[PDB]
């Protein structure tokens, strides 16, 4: 009955992931697309399989406060967790052991992004208005830039030399780390056009486009190509929501650059078609503000995480 | 087609600061945020450095008081706090006495 074109191998087209005991603040799909890293407010990371049971086969603990942001490392076996307990942590996924815990920040480490081409290096931007760059094998932080306003969202560019940081200061900045080996570098690019804070930053699958979610209830698409018009602003999306919760609401690109998914505070999973700049999917089902949405590496699968201690995991039909 | 009987009841999940903060921005102050995300609701109805300093002064002053290690302490006040319109109610109580006493013609 109803036989509507099963896309994925998942048992069902809509799967809810439960087992957390707090808000789920950020999630991430394995590069090989058969793992889930879910970081909750309960300062814990659930590791789920994407197929055949959706088994949370490991719960990694070790943060003393909410694990606000999780990415995987480029090979998928090491995990980068960032928290409110001022401590970013590198873990081994298969094992259940923590590898390297760096806690150099003074306040909540809101945002992080690990570099996708090059060395094992990740940026982390926290409440101290400082965006710091962290190389894996040294135990000191390799870079430290100081804005004046608490850093909400940070990303490392496709190519690996600049860092994007956006926060409460109404303008997102692009900085050059090789241009800066000093302790008070000044910003390279000032993307303006959001009318208040930025909450989430995603680097496009080609690297020319940066996605910014703003509590300006606006998704904005900028181009980072060093040869741009005077206004790097390309696209605007309307539809999602930000409320008094001021949660860390993020961005994502479909693995093809064809869709863009935002987490919203109206409990809705929003998925726009980037081209027509209009709303493809408006999926309900979450009882709390939708914190981050992640598109599965291979298939059109979208998985969302909410402040309702669950994660919906399903495929898109049209 | 509605959920509850007189409207739609839907589960919610926030962090607990947010319920309380909004409930008390409106509750006490009169004016707060709409829980729907649509604007704000209703109509509106610290500390210092010289004053902070002067309190530190009075603290150090109570510290400057001489202590006599010979002398026991006594209790002087010893419980001062414990030993510690009317017109309409006067007229009403007059009416009460009236309806009380009243509580207690034929022709051809």
């Amino acid at each position: 009955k109803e036989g509507i074109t099963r896309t994925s191998n998942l048992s069902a087209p809509i799967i809810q992931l439960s087992g957390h005991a707090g808000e789920v603040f950020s999630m991430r799909f394995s590069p090989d697309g058969q793992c889930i890293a879910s970081g909750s407010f309960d300062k814990t990371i659930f590791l789920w399989r994407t197929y055949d049971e959706n088994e949370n086969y490991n719960v990694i603990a070790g943060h003393r406060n909410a694990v606000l942001e999780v990415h995987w490392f480029t090979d998928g076996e090491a995990l980068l967790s960032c928290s409110a307990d001022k401590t970013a942590r590198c873990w081994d996924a298969e094992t259940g052991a923590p590898i390297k815990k760096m806690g150099e920040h003074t306040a909540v480490v809101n945002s992080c992004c690990p570099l996708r081409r090059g060395a094992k290096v990740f940026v982390t931007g926290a409440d101290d208005s400082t965006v710091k760059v962290w190389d894996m094998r040294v135990k000191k932080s390799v870079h430290t830039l100081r804005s004046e306003f608490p850093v909400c969202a940070v990303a490392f560019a496709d190519a690996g030399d600049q860092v994007y940081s956006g926060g409460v200061d109404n303008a997102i900045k692009v900085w050059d780390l090789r241009r800066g080996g000093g302790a008070d570098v000044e910003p390279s690019m000032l993307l303006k056009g959001h009318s208040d804070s930025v909450t989430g930053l995603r680097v496009s699958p080609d690297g020319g486009h940066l996605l910014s979610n703003a509590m300006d209830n606006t998704l904005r698409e900028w181009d980072v190509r060093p040869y741009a018009p005077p206004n790097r602003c390309t696209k605007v999306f309307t539809g999602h929501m930000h409320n008094f919760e001021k949660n860390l609401l993020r961005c994502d690109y479909a693995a093809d650059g064809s869709k863009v998914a935002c987490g919203s505070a109206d409990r809705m999973v929003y998925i726009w078609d980037t081209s027509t700049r209009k709303l493809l999917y408006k999926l309900p089902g979450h009882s709390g503000s939708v914190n981050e949405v992640v598109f599965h590496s291979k298939e059109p699968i979208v998985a969302s995480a909410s402040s309702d201690k669950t994660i919906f995991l399903g495929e898109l039909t049209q | 087609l509605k959920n509850h009987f007189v409207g739609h009841v839907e589960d919610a999940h926030m962090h607990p600061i947010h319920f309380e903060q909004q409930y008390h921005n409106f509750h006490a102050l009169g004016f707060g945020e709409a829980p729907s995300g649509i604007g704000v609701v209703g109509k509106p109805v610290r500390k210092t450095t010289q004053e902070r300093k002067a309190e530190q002064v009075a603290r150090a002053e109570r510290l400057a008081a001489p202590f006599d290690p010979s002398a026991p302490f006594s209790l002087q006040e010893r419980q001062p706090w414990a030993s510690k319109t009317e017109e309409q109610k006067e007229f009403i109580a007059k009416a009460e006495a009236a309806k009380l006493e009243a509580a207690a013609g034929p022709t051809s």
């Binding site: 048992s11 069902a12 809509i14 799967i15 809810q16 992931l17 439960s18 087992g19 957390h20 659930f46 590791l47 789920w48 049971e53 959706n54 088994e55 949370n56 086969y57 490991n58 719960v59 259940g96 999926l283 309900p284 089902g285 919906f312 995991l313 | 087609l1 509605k2 959920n3 739609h8 839907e10």
Partner: peptide
């Protein structure tokens, strides 16, 4: 080291 997670199939609820 299976953790305290489950995944169950559920439709997404709708408000109307």
């Amino acid at each position: 080291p299976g953790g305290p997670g489950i995944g169950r199939a559920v439709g997404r609820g709708m408000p109307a």
